Design an enzyme around this catalytic site. Structure first.
Site, PDB file in Angstrom:
ATOM      1  N   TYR A  73      51.940  -7.720 -18.076  1.00  0.00           N
ATOM      2  CA  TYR A  73      52.474  -8.352 -16.854  1.00  0.00           C
ATOM      3  C   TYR A  73      53.431  -9.478 -17.195  1.00  0.00           C
ATOM      4  O   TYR A  73      53.091 -10.407 -17.912  1.00  0.00           O
ATOM      5  CB  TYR A  73      51.325  -8.953 -15.990  1.00  0.00           C
ATOM      6  CG  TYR A  73      51.893  -9.915 -14.919  1.00  0.00           C
ATOM      7  CD1 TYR A  73      52.406  -9.309 -13.774  1.00  0.00           C
ATOM      8  CD2 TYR A  73      52.011 -11.311 -14.890  1.00  0.00           C
ATOM      9  CE1 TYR A  73      52.950 -10.019 -12.739  1.00  0.00           C
ATOM     10  CE2 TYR A  73      52.550 -12.074 -13.889  1.00  0.00           C
ATOM     11  CZ  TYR A  73      53.028 -11.398 -12.790  1.00  0.00           C
ATOM     12  OH  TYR A  73      53.564 -12.096 -11.745  1.00  0.00           O
TER      13      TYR A  73
ATOM     14  N   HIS B 281      66.939 -14.567  -6.597  1.00  0.00           N
ATOM     15  CA  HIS B 281      66.210 -15.832  -6.554  1.00  0.00           C
ATOM     16  C   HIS B 281      67.127 -17.010  -6.323  1.00  0.00           C
ATOM     17  O   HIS B 281      66.632 -18.090  -5.955  1.00  0.00           O
ATOM     18  CB  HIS B 281      65.359 -16.023  -7.820  1.00  0.00           C
ATOM     19  CG  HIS B 281      64.108 -15.162  -7.830  1.00  0.00           C
ATOM     20  ND1 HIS B 281      64.098 -13.824  -7.414  1.00  0.00           N
ATOM     21  CD2 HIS B 281      62.856 -15.475  -8.140  1.00  0.00           C
ATOM     22  CE1 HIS B 281      62.820 -13.388  -7.520  1.00  0.00           C
ATOM     23  NE2 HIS B 281      62.067 -14.368  -7.947  1.00  0.00           N
TER      24      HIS B 281
ATOM     25  N   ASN C  60      60.917 -19.630 -13.702  1.00  0.00           N
ATOM     26  CA  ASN C  60      59.643 -20.295 -13.431  1.00  0.00           C
ATOM     27  C   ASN C  60      59.671 -21.636 -14.129  1.00  0.00           C
ATOM     28  O   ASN C  60      60.143 -21.769 -15.254  1.00  0.00           O
ATOM     29  CB  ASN C  60      58.452 -19.510 -13.992  1.00  0.00           C
ATOM     30  CG  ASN C  60      58.006 -18.302 -13.250  1.00  0.00           C
ATOM     31  OD1 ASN C  60      56.981 -17.712 -13.543  1.00  0.00           O
ATOM     32  ND2 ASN C  60      58.706 -17.863 -12.293  1.00  0.00           N
TER      33      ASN C  60
ATOM     34  N   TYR D 240      53.117 -66.134   1.391  1.00  0.00           N
ATOM     35  CA  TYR D 240      52.679 -65.006   0.523  1.00  0.00           C
ATOM     36  C   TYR D 240      53.837 -64.232  -0.073  1.00  0.00           C
ATOM     37  O   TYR D 240      53.712 -63.709  -1.184  1.00  0.00           O
ATOM     38  CB  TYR D 240      51.782 -64.054   1.284  1.00  0.00           C
ATOM     39  CG  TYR D 240      50.484 -64.657   1.789  1.00  0.00           C
ATOM     40  CD1 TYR D 240      50.103 -65.969   1.578  1.00  0.00           C
ATOM     41  CD2 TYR D 240      49.624 -63.873   2.528  1.00  0.00           C
ATOM     42  CE1 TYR D 240      48.920 -66.508   2.065  1.00  0.00           C
ATOM     43  CE2 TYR D 240      48.440 -64.379   3.054  1.00  0.00           C
ATOM     44  CZ  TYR D 240      48.095 -65.710   2.793  1.00  0.00           C
ATOM     45  OH  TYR D 240      46.958 -66.236   3.340  1.00  0.00           O
TER      46      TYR D 240
ATOM     47  N   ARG E 103      54.237 -66.462  -3.114  1.00  0.00           N
ATOM     48  CA  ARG E 103      53.079 -66.750  -3.931  1.00  0.00           C
ATOM     49  C   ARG E 103      52.247 -65.516  -4.318  1.00  0.00           C
ATOM     50  O   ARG E 103      51.518 -65.548  -5.293  1.00  0.00           O
ATOM     51  CB  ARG E 103      52.214 -67.755  -3.182  1.00  0.00           C
ATOM     52  CG  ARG E 103      50.829 -68.036  -3.647  1.00  0.00           C
ATOM     53  CD  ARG E 103      50.263 -69.276  -3.055  1.00  0.00           C
ATOM     54  NE  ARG E 103      50.314 -69.418  -1.615  1.00  0.00           N
ATOM     55  CZ  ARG E 103      49.203 -69.511  -0.827  1.00  0.00           C
ATOM     56  NH1 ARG E 103      47.966 -69.393  -1.327  1.00  0.00           N
ATOM     57  NH2 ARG E 103      49.360 -69.736   0.480  1.00  0.00           N
TER      58      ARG E 103
ATOM     59  N   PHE F 250      53.503 -23.428 -13.348  1.00  0.00           N
ATOM     60  CA  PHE F 250      54.648 -23.641 -12.486  1.00  0.00           C
ATOM     61  C   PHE F 250      54.311 -24.448 -11.231  1.00  0.00           C
ATOM     62  O   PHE F 250      55.202 -24.849 -10.510  1.00  0.00           O
ATOM     63  CB  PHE F 250      55.255 -22.267 -12.107  1.00  0.00           C
ATOM     64  CG  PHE F 250      54.203 -21.300 -11.596  1.00  0.00           C
ATOM     65  CD1 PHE F 250      53.614 -21.431 -10.332  1.00  0.00           C
ATOM     66  CD2 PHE F 250      53.771 -20.252 -12.416  1.00  0.00           C
ATOM     67  CE1 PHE F 250      52.612 -20.600  -9.880  1.00  0.00           C
ATOM     68  CE2 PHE F 250      52.745 -19.406 -11.981  1.00  0.00           C
ATOM     69  CZ  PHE F 250      52.172 -19.574 -10.742  1.00  0.00           C
TER      70      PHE F 250
ATOM     71  N   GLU G 243      51.363 -16.358  -2.977  1.00  0.00           N
ATOM     72  CA  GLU G 243      51.920 -17.709  -3.148  1.00  0.00           C
ATOM     73  C   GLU G 243      51.311 -18.487  -1.992  1.00  0.00           C
ATOM     74  O   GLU G 243      51.954 -18.885  -1.000  1.00  0.00           O
ATOM     75  CB  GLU G 243      53.435 -18.035  -3.127  1.00  0.00           C
ATOM     76  CG  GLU G 243      54.440 -17.856  -4.227  1.00  0.00           C
ATOM     77  CD  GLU G 243      55.597 -18.809  -4.481  1.00  0.00           C
ATOM     78  OE1 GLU G 243      56.054 -19.727  -3.673  1.00  0.00           O
ATOM     79  OE2 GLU G 243      56.101 -18.615  -5.625  1.00  0.00           O
TER      80      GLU G 243
END
Lengths: 506, 506, 506, 506
Positions: free
Chosen positions: A53, A83, A192, A277, A280, A326, A411
């Site tokens: 794969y 892509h 990826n 503040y 300080r 990824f 996904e």
């Protein structure tokens, strides 16, 4: 910068330098073994007619279908083209360069099975200052931006050279290259990964660091302008709390302010009325910001060196394994962390501006101008600072808590790291504008303490601003003064006042 | 727990134990020198007729006005009474106990100038299990809640003992005490500080840790239920990324899952179809969460030991200095950081529930029930998980980015740490409900793989749930099952499966 | 209240009354035709052996499978049991009553195909003051809460009567009922709908209205306390802008303040120094809030009367149609709209408190107390108001923008209306606390203008508070005063001062 | 467009036209009386040696100090110069034009006391297409942007003409003008107001409307592509709920879809399996969005016509009154309301894209491509849509809930309307990209139903896209297709399909 890259060893200082300016790089000889060995592992799988794969399979129906040679070369090209589906403004060349170098670095660790020749083609583009078009949006955390970058390797897409768009074939020729054909696993190795997410967040980090440094100098100027005390910075207070960010921040204030100055001595034990503040509590607030940025920097400096593609090739064991590196979750959280720091640096600065405008608190004329019922002085600059600081509250909403399932629920959880990092850039513009206004106000207020000087480094900050922006003697068009102060801050005018070794990349 | 406290050395494990159950404490002998020496420094200022802000001054007109004895005792009482201006529900006794112990710890470091007798009165209350009323709201980061606590020392306010409200004089008598009169500096030493903010955030941390641990076990069960792969957890993938949180998280998954189980072997190289990200990216997402919680824990564990009042007394030099350690900015940011972790633990779990409900992805019957066009099974439990997970997105909005100026702009920047920490409690309820539903679903799905077992520790998780909730054989009233699973998680049923030394306080 | 209900005609005033107190209701005779006619349409489909989704089908495999009688009765029960999968605290009886009445109203419009006998059983529960247990959480916008309500009709679940939990069979008997068996379509008619979402948001509306009314009175008191002007309320200013909310708001201020008062006349043309925006921009800010609440009220008043189940039965044409009216998107947006109003009412009040505490702006002693370097007065009450107002910023983040896909992507977009509405309740507690503190401060400040009176209605506001809380003569335990002022506001002490016909439900 | 302006009567359609394209305007004769009469009232105050705040006073020490003539002319110039303190990118000319026209409109109502000659100078700039530089940021709701605009009237600042920056004196000369000198009240009349806030939000409204219209057409295409039903759009369902936005939205879907099409008939009673909510709940979700945008439009259309400066001159009574109409609270809330609509239009579209990509739900090939284990098709375009939709969740956080006190607490509550409106522009880019991808996907999916046609108007939508983007026959570089679809949407390609009289400005 000239870099002989030992993959996986980039420091945050080196990443800042890559982000800031062009680079010339080559791989160290020690990189070749693992790069070539994971290619040989891929080649052995193919020679042995094994099926793996993400090496020699299709996707989907064919995910454990060993498809034939022919289809496999073309499959790499089809992946890059399909892509490259991003949208939005083109990234600037500095960011494109950073993405390319991060991809080179990650692939060159030797776990991805991509030919050294393909890595060296990316290096040639960097060295030639040829920067592929990459659109800003589309990644959910970085297939699309990395596909756009990769188009140019195949002679598709476009690239910028000396500020002009070139066709990919002209761009390759500038770099001494011709179009390449990808092999098994190479489309996934290029597409990826987390390099766009990481680059976006690193830019946010570098901005946050620049703003931290400027805010120590601006806050020291504002302390002096309103006759504030140095006692809040005493090391014993900070040691007693024990927070490291605050300890180091107070040490920076002591370094810039010194034990006393002409202004502080001229007003002696001044201190009879406690400081607000926003003065300080600078060690406490700015220290919390420093810890936050250091948090994020630790995660991002690791990620810059990470093997983030998939599947990974472990040539020493002969194994190809599919995991999940990824997924940019840690980057998304690091960016959301940085948002808190950028926001609170700006909030505290905006309150110091407000203090300087308040005659009951500043011991200065209202709105920092003489003749004040006829002149408005800094009144509307202070409003601009409020607007910028306020915007950062909504912009601080986290992106790392959102996800949408993409592709028929496989996904099914994503990071949203790109959006998390990109919004830091505008937050940083907002905080930079606030600090620019504070710088202007405190230098104006110190001027009104006629002839008195602050400390050595804070006088350098006054001189830097007064080289471009004059004392505000009477109402005049205000905005050009803000513009110039912002540009000086963006160029790092104040960064070199901060002691070394405090900020992650500096 | 029985504790001989060396001030400033409390560990996160000790803080968890204090939060979880009653304590008996005394100070170590080594604490006496610095406590008594800062009192002697205060006494020397008064004996020498010197004037020191926050020791023997008033406030305001009188801030460097040495007021007389008389007025100074009464001034302490007036401060506690007027400052006890909080509102909202009473804190539970566990949280009150934690606040008291944090205040004891901080004061006992010897920088505050408060009599050892007053510290020992707070210790007596803790030891007697007498817990002052403290209302939830009012601090901006902790005058009001600490004033409410302190009322009981003066014989004002009320306190809880064996679950019942007592008058302060009855409560003091239970602890062997009578009402005290405060001395110079003691009102500020009791009221100024970050202990309520820190306690609220520590509770959030402990919840986040409990949920992390439960989510490793639940996610391992869900992997098994849907015939997922162990390859995503391979150490080499995580080493190659280099993120520590992810490395340690994958090691936890390997420990709980083991190399194989009867279920995984019975489906063999199963793996022919890649797992969804909600399974395969668990190390990456849960690892980012672990880093976030460790970030926060480092800051909170320091703050639990911090000297956080003001002004501070440095008896070794003879100096009293006013600074800003009461500003809880780092706590506010730590709490906002924890929100990201609690939210994303829940989001990832909710996606695993959704996967288990999806027949095309789960290899189980739709909605985890047999007879599914007549039975709805887990369909609406999954909706409940979606509702809970969604709420956490809005709840993740940061509080540390807000501030309002209080008291004529002197208190011009504050932290909002209390609000930041308190919202983690409800986020944790939401994520606990999601995980309860995941636990139920994965045990149901494993049951449907008739007679097969998962790993040793995951079978212990199945047995724990099945002791209270039966297999879902046919539609029945669903909610009592969720309630029981939530209560088991809240009691820590799954925490002990996680390897030691992973989570900050465990 | 005694109501003969014409379905679909409930007004917002009637909904407020239902929310506030018990009701006795029956259907108007004119409701019977359409109710019975949609049942007859369902009966005709079954008698004719036709198949209709959501009438006589299963779900899933069987969605257009006409299942047999037997299975269909049991299917209704299985739906209620399995769908009662909510979690969290029980709703209070007032809210349960509102949900029941909204469900009665919607079903009684005659588009749902449910027997009049089942509607009359819900009416009997209302009339008997028997309130099913409904847990707070689980709906994504309202299967689970409506399933929990419906359990009691079947003799399952539990119900509250005179503040005590009863078994469903005891609860039914109190109402004169025995357990029912549901028929075709009735499980969906009871469980599908927006009534919980709508009730949650209506409670938010009523709170927002109560707070608006109280804020007009409190803001009028604060104007008087600091010698503010009435000129900002002049009708001509508001007509010239043309915003209706602002016009009506300024008219309310004029009504409560009148043209002048003893206090305003005693300081004459006072006005020599312009008022701060928190006074002078009250019409503009409070008017924007009024428009927002009216926006939301229009949507919610429609939704209270909506047919919101599915599928719908159109007996006049003989059609059963599946649509989407159960999607509570408009309710979610109405609730998010109300959040803006509740937040900004509180923000403006908090700034008026801050003004009153500021001696340079208030023309009153600092912190509203005499002897102020020895007494702190309202200093920490002001901090509590800041904390409460700040919390509302994060709580304003919208829920209507989130969604998760539930059930194998068919339920692929949901509203999150329940979460949107529920968070308004806590926002309203926060704003109520701010206003309570403002009420206390302005009455204290007016007291310090010795012997002077404000207008007729504002004196009624002073008298209401002074019946429970004395003038602050010297520091004392502050919080009980805040508690009492909050309780008076929660009981509607100030609502009746506002002119009628301004707020949607009043 | 050629406009003879009756001040205060601009419609939303006219505002859209002004925003879209250049204008030529003059005042109607009926405007002269009130304009000249408020000038005469100002002149009478000065002639009578009366003193009026904001007419002939200074500010501050001098706020009721009648300063002399001399100082008063110069005071106007000093105000414009000092107030032009904005920062950030220049606004585009369309937005500058809208701001100028809104300012003309408001001043021309005759309540501001500014000379008609000054109004006519702004008109001359508009008519000459000369657009002052206005920077994006600085207003808190619009002194700074309106000061920048006003600079050019005085011969300061710069202006754009035919896309090039000109000096103010060249720009004035193009318009037939020379520099002006301002009179009493004119600096405040020009600088005080809500026109920038209102213009920013109106642009957001127009975008939201454009996106609504496009989403009806895209959603109708997606219904057809996946063989969805028309029954959800049946008028009786929507009448029974009673929500107007939903009624009108369903009517738009029926108009575009018609009763049936070749595609729907070719799949006949198709409907055997219920449609997902992203299809079937379009009337409910898009209707909620329509109500939200109508809410906002009502407020913004009033504000476009509002008198928003200060003090106001009421010549009929002889009164000058100081109020607060410059406070843009209602605009800020209207913009935050619009954010919900833009976000949810995009969310629902993104779910329809996800549906089309899901072979189990779409009845189309996976990822809308033939040869799918070798081609990725629309897989990464769908990811881009997810990224864009997700960004809108954080961007929906409201700005109207924030405020900072500016200028020694007098400006103690502000609106943040500019930030609220500006963020809508990027939200709209995100939703436009989602819809572009949906348009591409649904046209691709319909193509795969070989030779079949949808309805008349939806075929026009297919033809518009196919004029620029071809059927996706095989993987190719994807992004240029998205770019072209976005540009077609931005040009209003689909807007004209929507029935008239639905959207506020259309």
């Amino acid at each position: 910068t000239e870099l002989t890259l030992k993959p996986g060893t980039l420091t945050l200082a080196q990443l800042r330098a890559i982000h800031a300016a062009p680079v010339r790089l080559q791989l160290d000889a020690s990189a070749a073994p693992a790069i070539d060995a994971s290619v040989a592992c891929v080649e052995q799988i193919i020679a042995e007619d094994r099926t793996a794969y993400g090496i020699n399979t299709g996707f989907g129906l064919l995910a454990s279908t060993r498809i034939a040679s022919h289809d496999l070369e073309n499959l790499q090209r089809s992946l890059v083209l399909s892509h490259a589906a991003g949208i939005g403004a083109p990234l600037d060349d500095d960011l494109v360069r950073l993405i390319m170098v991060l991809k080179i670095n990650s692939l060159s660790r030797g776990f991805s099975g991509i030919r050294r020749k393909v890595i060296d083609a990316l290096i040639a583009l960097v060295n030639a200052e040829v920067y592929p078009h990459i659109p800003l949006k589309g990644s959910v955390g970085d297939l699309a931006p990395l596909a756009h970058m990769s188009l140019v390797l195949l002679g598709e897409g476009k690239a910028r050279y000396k500020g002009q768009w070139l066709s990919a074939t002209e761009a390759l020729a500038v770099a001494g290259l011709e179009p390449l054909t990808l092999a098994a696993k190479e489309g996934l190795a290029l597409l990826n990964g987390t390099q766009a997410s990481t680059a976006y967040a690193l830019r946010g980090l570098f901005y946050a660091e620049d703003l931290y440094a400027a805010a120590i100098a601006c806050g020291g100027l504002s302390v002096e302008a309103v006759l504030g005390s140095r006692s809040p910075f005493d090391a014993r207070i900070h040691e007693a709390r024990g927070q490291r960010g605050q300890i180091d921040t107070a040490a920076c204030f002591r370094d810039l302010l010194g034990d006393s100055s002409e202004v502080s001595l001229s007003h002696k034990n001044a201190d009879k009325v406690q400081d607000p503040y926003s003065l300080r509590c600078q060690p406490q607030v700015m220290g919390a910001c420093l810890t936050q940025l250091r948090q994020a920097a630790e995660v991002l400096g690791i990620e810059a060196n990470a093997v983030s593609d998939n599947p990974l090739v472990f040539a020493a064991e002969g194994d190809v394994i599919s995991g999940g590196n990824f997924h940019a979750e840690p980057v998304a959280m690091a960016a959301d962390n940085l948002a808190l720091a950028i926001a609170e640096i700006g909030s505290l600065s905006e309150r110091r501006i407000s203090l300087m405008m308040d005659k009951h608190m500043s011991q200065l004329p209202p709105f920092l101008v003489e003749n004040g019922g006829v002149n408005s002085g800094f009144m509307i600059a202070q409003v601009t600072a409020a607007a910028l600081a306020s915007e950062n509250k909504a912009l601080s909403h986290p992106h790392s808590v959102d996800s949408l399932p993409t592709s028929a629920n496989q996904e099914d959880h994503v990071s949203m790291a790109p959006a998390a990092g990109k919004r830091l850039w505008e937050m940083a513009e907002n905080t930079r504008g606030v600090l620019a206004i504070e710088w202007l106000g405190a230098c104006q207020g110190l001027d009104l303490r006629k002839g008195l000087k602050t400390s050595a480094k804070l006088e350098k900050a006054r001189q830097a601003l007064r080289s471009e922006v004059a004392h505000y003697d009477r109402d005049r068009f205000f905005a050009p003064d803000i513009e110039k102060a912002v540009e000086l801050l963006a160029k790092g005018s104040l960064t070199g006042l901060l002691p070394a070794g405090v900020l992650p990349s500096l």
